[PDB]
DNA sequence: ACTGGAGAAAGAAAGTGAAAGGAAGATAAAACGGGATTCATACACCGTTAAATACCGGTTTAAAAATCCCGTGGCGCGTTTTAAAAAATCTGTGCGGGTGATTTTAT
C-alpha cells in the first residue's frame, strides 16, 4: 500500500531514542581504557 | 436574442520612500583644585617688673524662688495606609562536537 497510518507517539519515541543512543554511545563520551573519543582515535 | 466565459478599464485600499525635529545622546575646550620647592619673615620660647585683680568680713535688698488653683491643648492608644527592603523567580552565556548556509576584489 502507498499509504499506511502511524501513531505520532511511537514515531517520536523511536526517533528520539535512536538519536539519543547514537549521541551517547558514539559521539560525546570517552572510553575508560584509553580516554579517547572516536574522532580522536580515527585521526590518530 | 440570449448565455456564460474572458479580457480590459476603472476605481479604492494598502505599502512605500522621503520628511523636520527633537529629545538623547555623544565628544573637546575650559575652568577648577590639589600636590612639590623657596625662602624671608613673622612667630615661639626665655629672664624682669608695675600693675591689675582675686580674696576676706559683714550688711542688705531687691529680685527670684517656692506654693496653690485651675483649665486646657499636647501626648497616648488603637487602627489604617504606604513606601522600602528582602526573598523568590526568570534570562543570558559559554564550553565542544554536529547540521546547514553567506560576501568583496583583479584581469
UniProtKB/Swiss-Prot annotation:
Location(s) in or outside the cell: Cytoplasm
Q: Which domain of life is it from?
A: Bacteria
Q: What is known of its domains?
A: An N-terminal fragment (residues 1-523) can be reconstituted with GyrB, but the complex no longer has negative supercoiling or ATP-independent DNA relaxation activities, although it is capable of DNA cleavage; ATP-dependent relaxation is inhibited by novobiocin and non-hydrolyzable ATP analogs. The fragment has ATP-dependent DNA relaxation and 30-fold improved decatenation activities, unlike holoenzyme it preferentially binds supercoiled DNA. The C-terminal domain (CTD, approximately residues 535-841) contains 6 tandemly repeated subdomains known as blades, each of which is composed of a 4-stranded antiparallel beta-sheet. The blades form a circular-shaped beta-pinwheel fold arranged in a spiral around a screw axis, to which DNA probably binds, inducing strong positive superhelicity (about 0.8 links/protein).
Additional record remark: When the enzyme transiently cleaves DNA a phosphotyrosine bond is formed between GyrA and DNA. In the presence of quinolones this intermediate can be trapped and is used as an indicator of drug toxicity. The enzyme-DNA intermediate is also the target of a number of topoisomerase poisons, including toxin CcdB. Few gyrases are as efficient as E.coli at forming negative supercoils. Not all organisms have 2 type II topoisomerases; in organisms with a single type II topoisomerase this enzyme also has to decatenate newly replicated chromosomes.
| Family named by the database record | Belongs to the type II topoisomerase GyrA/ParC subunit family.
Q: What does this protein do?
A: A type II topoisomerase that negatively supercoils closed circular double-stranded (ds) DNA in an ATP-dependent manner to maintain chromosomes in an underwound state. This makes better substrates for topoisomerase IV (ParC and ParE) which is the main enzyme that unlinks newly replicated chromosomes in E.coli. Gyrase catalyzes the interconversion of other topological isomers of dsDNA rings, including catenanes. Relaxes negatively supercoiled DNA in an ATP-independent manner. Negative supercoiling favors strand separation, and DNA replication, transcription, recombination and repair, all of which involve strand separation. Type II topoisomerases break and join 2 DNA strands simultaneously in an ATP-dependent manner.
Quaternary arrangement and interactors, per the entry?
Heterotetramer, composed of two GyrA and two GyrB chains. In the heterotetramer, GyrA contains the active site tyrosine that forms a transient covalent intermediate with the DNA, while GyrB binds cofactors and catalyzes ATP hydrolysis. Can form a 2:2 complex with toxin CcdB in which GyrA is inactive; rejuvenation of GyrA(2)CcdB(2) is effected by CcdA.
Q: Quote the protein name from its UniProt record.
A: DNA gyrase subunit A
- Protein species of origin: Escherichia coli (strain K12)
Shown residues within the full chain:
6 to 49 of 875
Amino acid at each position: 500500500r502507498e499509504i499506511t497510518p502511524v501513531n505520532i507517539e511511537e514515531e517520536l519515541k523511536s526517533s528520539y531514542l535512536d538519536y539519543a543512543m547514537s549521541v551517547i554511545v558514539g559521539r560525546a563520551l570517552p572510553d575508560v581504557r584509553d580516554g579517547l573519543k572516536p574522532v580522536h582515535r580515527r585521526v590518530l
